[PDB]
Design a protein around this nucleic acid. Sequence first.
DNA 1: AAAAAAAAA
DNA 2: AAAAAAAAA
DNA 3: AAAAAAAAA
DNA 4: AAAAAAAAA
Lengths: 161, 161, 161, 161
Amino acid sequence: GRVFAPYSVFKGKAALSAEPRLPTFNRLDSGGVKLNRRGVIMLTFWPSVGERKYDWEKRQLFALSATEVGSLISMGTRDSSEFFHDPSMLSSNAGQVRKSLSIKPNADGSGYFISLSVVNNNLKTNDRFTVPVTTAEFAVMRTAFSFALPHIMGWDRFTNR
Amino acid sequence: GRVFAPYSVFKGKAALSAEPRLPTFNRLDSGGVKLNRRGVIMLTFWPSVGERKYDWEKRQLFALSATEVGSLISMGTRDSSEFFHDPSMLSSNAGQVRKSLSIKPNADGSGYFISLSVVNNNLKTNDRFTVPVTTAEFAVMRTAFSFALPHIMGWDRFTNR
Amino acid sequence: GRVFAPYSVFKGKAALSAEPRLPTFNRLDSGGVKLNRRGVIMLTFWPSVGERKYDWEKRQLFALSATEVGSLISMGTRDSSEFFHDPSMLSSNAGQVRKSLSIKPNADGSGYFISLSVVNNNLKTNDRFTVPVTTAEFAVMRTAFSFALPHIMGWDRFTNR
Amino acid sequence: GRVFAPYSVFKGKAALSAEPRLPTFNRLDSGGVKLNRRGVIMLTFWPSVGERKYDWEKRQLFALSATEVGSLISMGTRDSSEFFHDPSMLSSNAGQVRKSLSIKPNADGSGYFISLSVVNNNLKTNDRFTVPVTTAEFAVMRTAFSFALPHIMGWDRFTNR
DNA sequence: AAAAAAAAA
DNA sequence: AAAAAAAAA
DNA sequence: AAAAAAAAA
DNA sequence: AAAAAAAAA
């Protein structure tokens, strides 16, 4: 069944959570197994209400694909990347919701700012959660993501006994 | 049985697929186990027919050995490597078919071009599939290959319980 | 049950031991599993009495969290980090005991000094164990810690079969 | 039982083989498990007799400890390391046999020379096998050794389920 | 709740 | 066949 | 369908 | 014996 062991970062204005969603497989009728829906690294952002307390119900999600992960783990100190996602893509509700994840170095080079933006043209809202991430914390993600990458790709199945 | 979870890259003129083929073992009569045929990282190239559609039947293969993998994961941004293979080697049909895989950085340093060339003197054909690969994508291969390397070498068997 | 395979470094004035403490989980009533208490990399320091012999009973501990680990594995040759811990935190006995772990490069760049300081205002004691660590040894920790990081985070549970 | 999957390099004058020997454990009477004898990365050198053929019976061994491994995987392009071993150490036959492993970059920086020297004062012999190693091959060892390091340390036992 | 799609045993 | 030793549940 | 070979318990 | 806490299925 499910497993809940997210790496989390709690800061002044918002919280960040990251955990792997494994790929789904389909047992073929040839006997073997085929990778079906792809795994990701899910990112959850949510706001801090009141004093050191976080409103879990106003949360927004961002699914990192294998390639977006590779883009992140290969980031240099002075590098920055930005990903743009439409949840309801190739679907009926396209163009309506627009997510954009940005990773930028801060002035000091003492880390990055990781912010999620969500623009919903249906509900007429504009949300933005930003979380500062230190070098040590981003080292955690880098390493944890690297480790997780083969698994979300399904490559952990290629095992000798 | 078999497992199908290839990392794939689909571009304008062709598609690239990479997946590990595990080594085969032979149970000795001493009780232990001996590595027999070696594992590789198989690369499959195939052409794009019509509009965003790929002719799976005109595909060519290239098997990366452990050492060729190590050559790839240790490539710098400005580096390039070229591998040359004869499928029917030390065999009757040698010199007939000639494969050459090249990995070159593009001008921008924004990635590499990965091309497969196949020259068949029997069928009198000359094929060449090239796929551009971004930094993020090549980061995926680098990481996925690194992870896979111990497995195709059989070293995943050396495990404490 | 428990497992005892610490990486150890024995030097002139003191000994250093490092081993992973895995996270604890709670099986939810939803069926799945939830990470409970977090894993760490435990560091044990203890003094050398007499000639090449070490007083196991005067030992002090320091628990590295995931983020402190990431801080360590991302250290450059010329880098240094210092962690400050209060064992009895958010508790009744706070402010009483104070631990500080320092990792500093030595002049030669031939490694680091890893020292633990413990100031106990209850028992009125002031302890300090320092252990020199070569590049090769610190390479061992770096690698061993990197490997261990996903496990103490609970991410080794995200596995395809 | 035993497992035989060595990474091997065959060159003009000699052959090199590398494979992990796992640590031995002792089940305590407390229930848990304790690491006993330490694992290593065994290196086997042997001479080439005649034309492309190798005299398996004149082979010499060198056991890499965890720390020696860390020294090797942290080697730069222009770096070189030398290890010195006495097989019959803290024993009756000490000082008699003397092994020295050297890893040096070649002029081109196109790899290293890995040579084993064995001086036996009992049998009055002086042996020396050298094997050139390319960047790609040394990348294989680096990666394969890194992967193996946690295992020979016993850290592969710290696993969540 | 999650950006999807292209080959195929 | 292998460089070993130091604490300890 | 795949570049192979060299030692050996 | 260990620096803890914040959401939640």
